[model samples]
Target chain A: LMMHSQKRVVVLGSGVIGLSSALILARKGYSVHILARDLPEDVSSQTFASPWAGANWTPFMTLTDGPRQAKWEESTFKKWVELVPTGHAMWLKGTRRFAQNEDGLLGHWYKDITPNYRPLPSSECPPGAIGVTYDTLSVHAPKYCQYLARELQKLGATFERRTVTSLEQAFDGADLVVNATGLGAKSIAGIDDQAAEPIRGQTVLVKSPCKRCTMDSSDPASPAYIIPRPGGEVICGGTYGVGDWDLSVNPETVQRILKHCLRLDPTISSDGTIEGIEVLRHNVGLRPARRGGPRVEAERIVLPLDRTKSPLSLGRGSARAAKEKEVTLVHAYGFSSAGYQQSWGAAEDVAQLVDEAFQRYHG
Target chain B: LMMHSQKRVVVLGSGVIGLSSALILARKGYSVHILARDLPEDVSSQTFASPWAGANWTPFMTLTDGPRQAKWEESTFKKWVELVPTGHAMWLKGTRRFAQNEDGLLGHWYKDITPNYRPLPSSECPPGAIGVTYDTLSVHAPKYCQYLARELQKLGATFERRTVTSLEQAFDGADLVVNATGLGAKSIAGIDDQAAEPIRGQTVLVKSPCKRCTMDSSDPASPAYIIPRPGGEVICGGTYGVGDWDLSVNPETVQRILKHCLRLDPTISSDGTIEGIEVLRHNVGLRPARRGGPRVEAERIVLPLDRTKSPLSLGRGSARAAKEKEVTLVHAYGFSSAGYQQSWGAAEDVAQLVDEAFQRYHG
Candidate 1:
């Protein structure tokens, strides 16, 4: 119940990760101000990425060795577990992964996280020759994002609605600025972190909730599992096209999703479907990805000022690209699908770096 | 995959029911034409009804003889069953109804519906002593309506954007026309069908999906339910004000709904509490109630003009209500919640009637 007037923290972006960080920062006695193109009240990050998740905390981290990924995921899982009963629209009942494809690369991604990750007993295998069933959490992104925003507002953070064209705009005079823009890190701040690329994921949010969660890493060819939410619909996904930024939901992708899900449970086949499944709206979100896992390192960027223009720029737009000498900057984005899964841990690291830099200046 | 030649079919309103009717008719080898204030694309019925449903199917019918309610519920249920496996966003499954305020009117409304509708075994009660539990179905109205419209286009229906004012205006030269203006029915082609009174239902769509399909018939004063749809937040409703024409969603009503829902479930009443429920929007829909029941009977009237200026007359701002004359008319609306539940059935009945009338005309 602390008042926000005592501390100041500048947070960037309003996606799932940004908003979650803002909520926590504000609660910790910081006068948090969120600056981003999206507000929790508007079209949100959850509506796109977070909500679109076949989200369970099964670490796809086996795909890389970036300790930051694991660290972030662990921290987020802690918050998620504690807040599970808080009605944040997430289900902690572990997911089951069924792998049908022998050649698909998706298996490698699920090699580690599915608890008791192992091939099903020969007797348990359905007509399909092989698959793995294990446990992970399932999340409903939209409600969770809204809950976080509401909690943050309750604590004492004031939010400013503005889109930063450059990261330096966030660095000026603020005690600490965290760059939590997911895909925005590419053009807005010109971070040019090659690791940040768009992995277009397309999903069909159907009116189905499975009793338990399942992911079939076994399907190296076509891997899919049903994750039933405690209250919401089952999300069926998707294709991961790296560097593909197509926002339009491809009709063909939908057809493929249906085919794959029906293959898992022929009852879900288009011809003999269940009672209430509807293809709500076809959606696509660009997961900020990297050829070399996520980077959470802190660094300073000085936005060069123009003599003709005022030293201070107007709005979120910056005048020059070079790092300005007077300010300290911490870049903290590029975590894509793992954004919600690892939000808090990443924020804590950023906090440590900010604290160190602050002492250096004052000491 | 079968192509049928154009056959004539008349649709009543441009709202979800009428639009859906038109869409289906067009798909099934009929040359569907719609008459209403807005075209299918412009009607608020799409998103207007979209946000306001915890919409699983629970029979809201009085167990009367006419079989109107039973027929509609069964038909709609069957249709939803078919679509559930198709990954549609419009469907929701596994409902659990709750009853609060033990000896009240909401309790009465839920009397028959609450199977397993018992006091929460003391241990399960969230502090309140009296409540019940049951199941129901919910539809994500807006997204579903849009989905229907998309299908209608695929079916090639003709949508006309015009409000039918006088009997002559609506019924002139056409062999058949159906009246489905809902509240607009009080004045359309035929003026007074004693049954068509407005039962105002107001609701607030909150960001939280009350994780179960819950209904509270325990409180008679206000009966409500929570339908957690996959693509939507939760639909919390509503007030049934007979003959009340207040179409605007009142903030006070929304507050009460939030309070009532949280009061029933302690899990939802955390530190956040009822006031913490973030509302996405508020809505009002006048259920076009009838006295005897949903009227599918064929009836015709002489279009008579009165001092009450036709809304169409008011448009030109010249024609006085007193100067109009008597003309022939036809009627076919007045289905309340049954509209969605019995849309296909009603359309079928109306279509058959029109076909017979046209056949007689040709003879």
Candidate 2:
């Protein structure tokens, strides 16, 4: 109890969301320890969803609140601008956005992103390319994830590469345990966000002259982008299927990617053949998208001291859960792929909530 | 017969080496085209040797053939040197070598490499490190391959993504055909003299504080290297199994790699966890090695073009293997992992051979 002010913290899952949150907290003087069932592989970042992204700084939460989405995106955009010049190679690249109707594939991805979000004047448009928006931003998932992990370690965040059997385990030495597990929260020790389902996306990163971040929203159903990196490789993606746990890249879909990119811009290929663009590799990621908007609110979850029982069994540990309120536990997850967009801000909000709770209980 | 003066060159395989060679030849004013069974995906380079390469100017070859090998390496080295200064981010790093007597991993690969190889002086060694040597460079295979392919396309080379049924089919439409397919030659359009076999090698590219290009001969039989690339990921590799063609990365091998790297320098992970060093990815590549080194000579093979009766085979344009004296083809294949070390020189030799052949035949 004497260390109550220390504000011990436990972050569940080490994916991008969890790691990013942990990074923010640890840097803010919190004693943060990350618990994960698996760590990022030599081939992937814990928050690798950043890779499957045909990512541009376009406002994605469009067809809704303009101001709020603009704030989140602008903040993230500024964060990106600062990071890229400071050694985040994966976080930077030049982008070109082609014309897409308001209800087009790319239109929905950029409803509220300010400054860079605008229609191309007729003078700036190519013959068939009715609209064009060129900017400087994109994410290389592989290197970005690696960079994030490297940055986290540099900041002295401790990443525990082990599976937690129960929330009670984190409670042993920590005063607060946060659930930022993303899709893994369903299977995590104390949280039962039953509505949580893995939204899978499959994509391929390739090498081509379409090196700029070019989004072809000619069709809203299959809005795609060819993001070229410094090394002549471009990331062409993807599929957004809700509740898809499948991790394997689909062959037919890959064929379509080539077809679509070639159609979007014939110059994408020298011979207008899919085989012409040098292929870097294929990837799959599951975004933990909640049914409604992301749930940023904090919640207290408790489990039996002997939490070896099935995690889904309701009320088995509610009594224990209530008694465990002495410790600070905040549930901050379900960002889906927006983890990158919301991580820094989410952590700030979470810290404030924890601080308020601590004030009420101890001050 | 009237189009005889116009050289028809058919290149087999579309991997970096093959594509680059075809591209170069086409630029030199030859009518060049490629025959490949499968068109490479954008990520194709990432999967095999190209993307996985540490990609430096390091030459791994015995200077034994003195002037011959030296001329090839010297010219090749000079070319790479020029590319590095450019913002070719992939052509970014160089390497340092070490000597070991025992037959381990990389030692076996470099044992017969150069005559000037030696152990590093004590003071010259990295802190907490052992012997080192002179002579070695690194490379970025992925971007380099793409760069080469792009340069080749700029030269107006035509390509066909199809499998060749036979050596005769490949050479039939061309005055000359060059086989640049690496391990693919072992099974494609089989020519036994090529004597190609897969020497499998695996490596894990990780995020680490390592900035130097290093090769440790501590295990002569399994010489390993820690090569840093321009992209911030350091590649660790060792282990060569001839006839082993499995491309899937082994998890246990990755564990062994972490252990070995940590042993080399305790500071590698003072935290004593693999997660401390972020892993970029793990990959596998098979070098097409043959007994007496790469078979880079012209051969004349003769066979009945038709399986019908003898008379029908005669003027039915009997399949005369390219090795036949009149049909001039430069056969360059069977260079396992050392392809990077020798690709340019080998290509030059083929180019020269074709030039000389044309000078004699046409004159």
Candidate 3:
């Protein structure tokens, strides 16, 4: 390993994107420090969405964006494919995506990336469905996040549980700053790039008899999928609320999911009803989203000294909102539901920016 | 190892008390199964108080009750003493407890049990202080809870993330029920033990200059303590509210804690005040205390089958709130701040009850 020990980088989150970025930055020899309120070890925060993902390596980006999304999707797919054999992730074999429309928005981009791609014959397809089977990956989201943290630790990345009200509080004389704060970007001051929004998602974890990964868009009104992890527990999901922020589990939603999944995959229950499904937990997390898609670019912004009080600032308060020294900032959030799907690729971009900024500073 | 595979035990909640009880039961071959809303792995709920403990073992059992409290304390002390050398706990050596009152209600009961205990000279003590130095134990509270959970898993205990609305909801055809629900007893139906209340506590995790374990009861109005764990970080605390349930961090309290701790021990800061105290995180947790002290007892309770639906029951509603079957139930909770202090002993009692119930059933 090369020593860029003097170059310090602070990543402002601990979700998959932040953790993955920190890991990559550390591997690049930058002294990486992670500041997060909801840590990987005890991630019960609803806003910290990484823990609640189905997290299977199926691309959700479609005609909505350029091939850039596909590139990120393919890049992360390769990393997950590599990890699938090692243990952090599970092999998503025989994954069947049943779409209502032939021109479905999801998993189409993944067909080329995943080998063994085949369209199921009309006879094999369920009622009113177009089915495609391929190989991919799935992960126990919370455990995987912890695995990422541990991996970062092995590479000498330090972390602390600190909440930052402003972006300046996070930049305590760091050479570079990576902002992967997810939905936290909406509120944290200094970088008020106000495009980020919460696309809430809910899921139910169950110990079902079915082990295969299945996505059913047969009923276009309600999308349902079953993602099996390393353990016998399967993540049965879910409802997508584009702007919903309600963290509480809805009983009606649970019934609807049970009925939908029970009908979509009969293997989930041996009995006549959803009662046979051993429901373990109900999870709700706001997928940090934006209609503009994910932002992955770099810029230099000078935090006004008046508005910016250092984390270790004395209680005597600050001066007027005067111009302050500029700092190299890399914005790498708004990946939404694809945060984990694009984590590795996004982190690579972040590290690249950090490296570029380091050269700019040294000169 | 005996084949009591037929003996099924369900432990409610996943706090220290519940986890310890489940571990003991699993070790005794009870086929322990733990059902909790707040799991050990991702414990971010404020009501789930195990993660926020300063958790240094210094006897706080005053003359309130009898020798039973002392027994639980001393018995648990032995377990911690053994664990101090292990990776799970840290040895609390040269622990100085400065008291405002000569007949302080705390630590006096532990003097005889702890090795190398003596009163400090008036010179060595801070102003207007009665100091007693003794050996105790400190733990990274969150990690220690995880250690307990992992230990239970090693003994073949099964866990599921489940929310129980009523006591009957938790008794899923189990042979015995161990209720270590902590403050959850106040709300969960069928057993609304009104005696249980929330005594909230607040603490700050900081990277400090001081590494010694010190407790200052010098200020009769506000108490303070500094507990250093295996990590370089130390937990400086805090405010103890008898009924406060505020989860938000109070800035005033933080300043007060920093001032009190810094004055109690000058080694925490360099340029005067709390400027040098590198605060990592602020934590608040409700202590499940009872004026009746901790209740460790066993009883038989019948759940009305009409009101109770098995976890795997059919969705076709329930019968009338009428007669049902009986199950052996053990009640163990309300340890307040001394939960970790009494964990092993309380769990021992819980397992004893389980054994007694099994014998009675066999007869």
Best by TM-score: 3
* Model 3 stretches with alpha carbons more than 4 Å out: A1-4, A63-66, A105-107, A270-273, A304-323, B1-363
TM-scores for all predictions: 0.46, 0.46, 0.55
Q: Residue B261, candidate 3: how far off, in angstroms?
A: 35
In model 2 chain B, which range of ten residues has the least summed lDDT? B309-318
Write down the TM-score for model 2.
0.46
State residue A221's C-alpha deviation in candidate 2, in Å: 4.6
* DockQ per candidate: 0.01, 0.01, 0.03
Give the fraction of true interface contacts kept by model 3.
0.00
| Real contacts recovered, all predictions | 0.00, 0.00, 0.00
Residue range B204-291, candidate 3, lDDT tens digits: 7776646688888778777798888868777888877875544545556767887888777766655545765666666678888877
Give lDDT: candidate 2, residue B128. 40
Q: Each prediction's Cα lDDT score?
A: 0.56, 0.58, 0.76
Angstrom error of the Cα, residue A281, model 2: value is: 1.0
